[PDB]
Amino acid sequence: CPLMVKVLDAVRGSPAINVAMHVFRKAADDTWEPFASGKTSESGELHGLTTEEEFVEGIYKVEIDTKSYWKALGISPFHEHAEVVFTANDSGPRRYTIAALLSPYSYSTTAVVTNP
Amino acid sequence: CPLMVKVLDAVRGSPAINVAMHVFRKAADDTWEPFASGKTSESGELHGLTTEEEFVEGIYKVEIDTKSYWKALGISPFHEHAEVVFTANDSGPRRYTIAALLSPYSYSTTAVVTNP
Amino acid sequence: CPLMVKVLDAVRGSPAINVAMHVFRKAADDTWEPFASGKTSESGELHGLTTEEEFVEGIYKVEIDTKSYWKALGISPFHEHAEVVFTANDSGPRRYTIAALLSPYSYSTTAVVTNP
Amino acid sequence: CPLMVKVLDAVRGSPAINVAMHVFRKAADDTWEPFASGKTSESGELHGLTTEEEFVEGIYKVEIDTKSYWKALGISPFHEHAEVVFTANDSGPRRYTIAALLSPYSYSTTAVVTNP
Ligand SMILES: N#Cc1cc(I)c(O)c(I)c1
Ligand SMILES: N#Cc1cc(I)c(O)c(I)c1
Numbered sequence A, B, C, D: 001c002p003l004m005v006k007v008l009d010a011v012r013g014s015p016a017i018n019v020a021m022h023v024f025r026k027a028a029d030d031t032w033e034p035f036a037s038g039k040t041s042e043s044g045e046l047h048g049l050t051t052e053e054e055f056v057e058g059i060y061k062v063e064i065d066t067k068s069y070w071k072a073l074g075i076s077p078f079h080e081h082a083e084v085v086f087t088a089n090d091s092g093p094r095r096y097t098i099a100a101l102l103s104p105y106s107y108s109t110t111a112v113v114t115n116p
């Protein structure tokens, strides 16, 4: 599991559960190709998006569907989604944890990058 | 000032100056059409992106080149850029301030939306 | 304006108005001596806390009553208050902007420090 | 383990390791009494601060020594420490995870509160 995403709800002080996300990888022609997808568990975490073999060097984009999450709570939020765009594995394989901290009109995103 | 972007440097405790960004508007075929652009001033602010007449309902994307900012300071950052994607003006004109608070491995973005 | 505090509401996407705060300065016996206070304006800003002559080297604490702010909106928040503790003016006068970005279960605070 | 604190370094994209913190609890006379202390592990986490039996209702203050952390890296940061002040267990026993995301001139703190 070289890529994990964790999402927290800053309004309720809880993991953000059942948050969908779509992961793209930039292709050779500079377009976004589908890479992986899933939704967060009861812990706010999404594990198992990819494998060490599949997660090669590249530019990846994680699109977190924050709008659906807020709308289901009756909140009309600002953002369409929370986006995270990054180059991965440029200097060899790494493990990435992406955290997203969500409020209706604000989000933060942080990466913890470790060398296995 | 229908749309203003303010960028702060959370490492140095200063406005983030000379930060380049492009703004796009989503087209009917889901592609991103060029809309506005500029770079932040010595106050970290970018004013004059659009006018009220031009800034109508749509999904807008602000792509902030945070990578170039950090690289100019000799820091290898995580993100390729900071993206802010939002629907604007769906209830008629509003004034939007997008704030971005930058660190090498983390950013936060917040919107202040006011009715004229 | 040697010390200014700006407070934003990350749930509603607005300045946080009428937010009360007290500023203290640490005494030689480690107790907190009253220094300044006020509440944020309709722009979310609190100006006029001190003057350059009065604002000398020390450890300062800004105690922002975020709990009362959320309770007035019918939200039970996590924090009793948001505290910002920092040494100021140890290299002579500077100008300080303290920003606080508020959510019920999360806050961020950033400083912008400039040399006059 | 009803209280856990996790600290992340937003400059380096890593857990903040060996970060000291001191936890106080407000006494009946409105003074801060010592409650617990420790430092973060290699994962950025501090477990075992207290027990279910000892962690009664009260107002608690976690003081995270962020200044020593940055200084050891050669950075002169803004804050003396990152503070988290909260009422715990007001409606029965809960489990608290406090996360702190650190930059030299900015920090965020978020709580995840769960019912066992
Ligand atoms: N694999 C895969 C996959 C990638 C994307 I981008 C998706 O939106 C979905 I649904 C699946
Ligand atoms: N923001 C944030 C954040 C909160 C928790 I709890 C984490 O484990 C990580 I990694 C990041």
Ligand SMILES: N#Cc1cc(I)c(O)c(I)c1
Pocket: B006, B008, B097, B099, B101, B112, C006, C008, C097, C099, C100, C101, C110, C112
């Ligand atoms: N965080 C933050 C923040 C700081 C400043 I100085 C701003 O003007 C705005 I808008 C947001």
Ligand SMILES: N#Cc1cc(I)c(O)c(I)c1
Pocket: D022, D023, D024, D033, D034, D035, D036, D037
């Ligand atoms: N128990 C305990 C304990 C509480 C505090 I506050 C401390 O600063 C130390 I050192 C230990």
